[PDB]
Write a protein that binds this ligand. Structure first.
Ligand SMILES: Nc1[nH]c(N)c2ccccc12
Ligand code: NI
Ligand code: NI
Length: 329
């Protein structure tokens, strides 16, 4: 099942210090971790310490956990360690801007959930696993990969010296694993459509109440979608480069489907790259823009995410009209 970091790996992280200039930058929604790869594990420790406090976790167990999580992301084009840290940074920015809406247990649970939410992704969609009766689809009949990512998270926590949550009360341990489970399962975009619709209704009717656990769960669910999709909230060149990686995965999957006698959906067909700009327009109109619109209504300080998403939508529209300027691969 699960891989473990080296002694040298975690002890190195324990020693890391975040360059001073980066402290100011990491607070901003639009921050791109891309140019700082050696620092990604340290960036995560920094975020946990700012959000949750330097005493939240025993530092050794936290650095062991982080480096073993990294080792259990695969070398796939998109659903990899870079994506994990990017999603956790978006969650950090949301939490910093909305800090006292969330409990200390939720903040720690959500930062961990974001880091873990795609653990052991193989570069194949739920659609593929289920079309082709992969064993995971037999074990997990809905939200197949997401149930797997949660199981991997639990596996890593159970590794010797890796349980960062062991110091919580017996009740709080149960509560945080549930926070993490619901948060990971919520990253299944199949569930997003229903969740966003429910939230929009709750908000528009004024029945939305964050003292109501089921409402809190739904808000946290939408935060998870917003963080999972946050490549669409970066500056255009970063968004575009990330889209290249997303599609590399999709096209490798479509290649597999051709061999099994199914023509893939256009989005996963490398011979249909001309349809990508309209495909992105559809995704922004149906998924991304509604998501950030609703999130901004519920959490006003998240508005820059929506502004950036709208700017990117405008850029894809420019591509469609043939107005794009030079892009670098
Ligand atoms: N950016 C982007 N486009 C599509 N179609 C996506 C699907 C999942 C996650 C991000 C995506
Ligand atoms: Ni996922
Ligand atoms: Ni993801």
């Amino acid at each position: 099942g699960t891989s473990i970091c080296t002694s040298e790996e975690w002890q190195g992280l324990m020693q890391f210090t975040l360059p001073v200039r980066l402290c100011k930058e990491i607070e901003l929604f639009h921050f791109d971790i891309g140019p700082f790869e050696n620092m990604w594990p340290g960036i995560f420790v920094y975020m946990v310490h700012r959000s949750c406090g330097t005493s939240c976790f025993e530092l050794e167990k936290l650095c062991r956990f982080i480096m073993s999580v990294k080792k259990n992301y695969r070398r796939v084009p998109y659903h990899n360690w870079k994506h994990a840290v990017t999603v956790a940074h978006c969650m950090y920015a949301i939490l910093q801007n909305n800090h006292t809406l969330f409990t200390d247990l939720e903040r720690k649970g959500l930062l961990i959930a974001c880091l873990c939410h795609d653990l052991d992704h193989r570069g194949f969609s739920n659609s593929y696993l289920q079309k082709f009766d992969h064993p995971l689809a037999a074990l997990y009949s809905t939200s197949t990969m997401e149930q797997h990512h949660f199981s991997q998270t639990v596996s890593i926590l159970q590794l010797e010296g890796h349980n960062i949550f062991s110091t919580l009360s017996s009740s709080e341990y149960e509560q945080v694993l549930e926070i993490i489970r619901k948060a990971i399962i919520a990253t299944d975009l199949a569930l997003y459509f229903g969740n966003r619709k429910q939230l929009e209704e709750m908000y528009q009717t004024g029945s939305l109440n964050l003292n109501n656990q089921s409402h809190r769960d739904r808000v946290i669910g939408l935060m998870m979608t917003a963080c999972d999709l946050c490549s669409v909230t970066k500056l255009w060149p970063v968004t575009k480069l990330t889209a290249n990686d997303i599609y590399a995965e999709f096209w490798a999957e479509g290649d597999e489907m051709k061999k099994l006698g199914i023509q893939p959906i256009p989005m996963m067909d490398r011979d249909k790259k001309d349809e990508v700009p309209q495909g992105q327009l559809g995704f922004y109109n149906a998924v991304a823009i509604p998501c950030y619109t609703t999130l901004t209504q519920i959490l006003p300080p998240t508005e820059p995410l929506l502004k950036a998403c709208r700017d990117n939508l405008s850029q894809w529209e420019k591509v469609i009209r043939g107005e794009e300027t030079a892009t670098w691969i």
